[PDB]
């Protein structure tokens, strides 16, 4: 019912009346007589193609990849072009469509002349959610932290990685934790840190001490209303090291 930017859309049109040949996979949407159009505010794909699931099933399907706009920093690392803004493709599956931070998507089908059917959805940014897997850790254990922000699914067909900041009371400088996506379109990220007590914090190692709270924070560059395109909210989670 609601999507996110750079998210993958699947469309199912159940139109049995377009099963012209019982032994051929039927195509809809590629002609002036029978057009379809997938559009967001600002950009559209016209004469898009949808294909039949099986030869005599009468169900048509397709997929389009949202792309967002090229002028942003979802990472917050200061160089733009995190999400390429591209629009092309006229196949059942190879659709690319540009999008805005707050937007709407619609799919239109003219099955007979001077009648159309439409399906609509919303496109909204989302807040981040960060938590350690366990409340307490040992002084020599290893740490994994889970962050959930569907807006960071920059590639829906690939696994994505971004850097969370990890520091402790002992060392405020801390480390940059690289979290990674569990699956190509789940938008859930996880990473691993070593706990040292007798050495410097470097890479994924974090110098800590007994009863020393550790902190991991994620800067949400993709935040919906009431916040603006420029607001940079910080979500962080903490855990205590008690032996």
């Amino acid at each position: 019912k609601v999507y996110s930017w750079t998210d993958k859309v699947y469309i199912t049109i159940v139109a049995p009346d377009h099963n012209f040949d019982s032994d051929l996979v039927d195509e809809i949407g590629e002609t002036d007589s029978d057009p379809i159009k997938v559009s967001t505010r600002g950009f559209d794909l016209d004469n898009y193609k949808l294909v039949e699931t099986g030869t005599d099933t009468g169900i048509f399907t397709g997929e389009v990849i949202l792309t967002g706009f090229t002028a942003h920093d979802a990472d917050g690392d200061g160089n733009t072009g995190d999400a390429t803004g591209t629009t092309s493709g006229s196949g059942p599956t190879d659709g690319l469509l540009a999008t805005d931070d707050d937007d709407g998507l619609t799919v239109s089908f003219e099955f007979s002349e001077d009648e159309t059917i439409v399906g609509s959805a919303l496109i909204r940014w989302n807040i981040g959610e960060v938590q350690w897997l366990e409340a307490s850790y040992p002084a020599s254990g290893t740490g994994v932290v889970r962050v959930i922000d569907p807006d960071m699914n920059l590639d829906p067909e690939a696994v994505d990685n971004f850097e969370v900041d990890v520091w402790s009371d002992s060392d405020a400088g801390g480390i940059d934790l690289t979290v990674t996506e569990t699956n190509e379109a789940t938008g859930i990220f996880e990473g691993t840190v070593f706990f040292t007590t007798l050495d410097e914090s470097s890479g994924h190692r974090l110098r800590v001490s007994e009863g020393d709270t550790v902190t991991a924070e994620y800067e949400d560059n993709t935040l919906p209303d009431p916040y603006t395109t420029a607001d940079e909210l910080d979500i962080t989670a903490t855990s205590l090291i008690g032996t």
Binding site: N79, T93, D155, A158, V179, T180
Partner: protein, 361 residues
């Protein structure tokens, strides 16, 4: 509709030799991407005989598309030009290593997956059917330590680059289509992402489709252990090293130098290899000559060591303290292989069953 799958979900970060850096000679990595042997064996500065040979990752990519099985009892190939893309991404920035599907061509790495002419980019070449009736295709591609987005962390590497093009040169332009930013170098860090995308020219619906698999680079710290704590002098001990950093190729069992381990005791301090004190190598009688994997994909290495009589013309005592030390260049702490170190230790004993003297009368 095709599917593509990668060899493994997690990969070690690759490293290099001293021959890759243009930095001045030193007795330590000094921020270079090398994996030195234990310090007790190092002679002055690090030279070619005092580090593990170049560690290049080898991955295997398989595409399961029956539509390319034209010959049902004969060899086939995936002949669809540039239908497979291999890329390394770090956050937003991306680097495309090459294409497969077309006849092999000398090219360069692409920066940002952005380059206008695809003929300029490296092609890995046409893939081959694993069996005549399988319908599955495989590619073998080699990933060096220099292949990824430019970063400030790797400015310490005075990197000389392997010229992918026909020319002989050690500049970033010879291997990448775009020069690196000043104060930055191209490299792989821990937490980077490897993805392959397959552009199926005919899917279940008869049109184009893109399918993908992904994996992460990672480094882990080693566990060193033995079969039992106490050994009789001259007995055989089983020594085990758990370094996932070292399973560079899944298909083969990787071999690693035995000089990585330290033997320090009252008798002598030695590397238990060809770089130890004179006659130490023969005093241990390793079988095999050095570490070896216990299978294709285990990351577990075993060696059989005989407890010496006399290391350096000094004989071992009963109950003597023996420490085994391995320096894991590339712990969990380090971001690249080089950089920080962590020491993993094992303690073992010669046996101490007291003696008695008896007389008849």
């Amino acid at each position: 509709t095709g599917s593509v799958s990668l060899d493994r979900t997690v990969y070690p970060v690759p490293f290099g030799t001293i021959a890759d850096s243009s930095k001045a000679a030193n007795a330590a990595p000094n921020g270079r991407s090398v994996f030195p042997i234990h310090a007790t064996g190092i002679t002055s500065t690090i030279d070619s005989t005092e580090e593990l040979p170049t560690g290049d990752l080898t991955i295997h990519v398989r595409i399961n598309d029956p539509d390319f099985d034209e010959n049902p009892a004969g060899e086939d190939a995936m002949d669809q030009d540039n239908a497979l893309k291999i890329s390394v991404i770090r956050g937003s920035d991306s680097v495309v290593l090459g294409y497969a599907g077309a006849s092999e061509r000398t090219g360069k790495i692409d920066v940002g997956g952005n380059n206008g002419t695809i003929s300029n980019i490296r092609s890995f070449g046409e893939m081959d059917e694993i069996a005549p009736d399988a319908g599955i295709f495989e590619l073998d591609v080699n990933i060096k330590f220099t292949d990824g987005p430019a970063s400030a962390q790797c400015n310490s590497h005075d990197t000389l680059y392997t010229a992918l093009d026909g020319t002989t040169g050690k500049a970033d332009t010879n291997r990448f289509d775009d020069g690196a930013a000043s104060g930055q170098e191209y490299c792989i860090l821990q937490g980077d992402i490897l993805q392959v995308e397959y552009t199926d020219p005919a899917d279940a619906s008869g049109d184009a489709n893109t399918v993908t698999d992904s994996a992460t680079f990672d480094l882990r710290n080693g566990v060193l252990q033995s079969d039992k704590s106490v050994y009789i002098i001259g007995s055989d001990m089983i020594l085990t090293l758990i370094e996932p950093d070292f399973d560079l190729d899944n298909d083969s069992a990787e071999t690693y130098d035995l000089d990585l381990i330290e033997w320090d005791s009252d008798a002598a301090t030695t590397t238990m290899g060809n770089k130890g004190v004179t006659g130490a190598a023969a005093a241990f009688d390793p079988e095999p000559t050095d570490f070896r994997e216990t299978g294709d994909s285990t990351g577990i290495f075993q060696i059989v060591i005989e407890i010496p009589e006399s290391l350096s013309n000094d004989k071992l005592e009963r109950g003597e303290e023996i420490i085994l030390e391995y320096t894991d260049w590339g712990p969990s702490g380090s971001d690249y292989v080089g950089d920080e170190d962590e020491d993993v230790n094992l303690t073992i004993y010669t046996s101490n069953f007291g003696a008695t003297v008896e007389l008849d009368q």
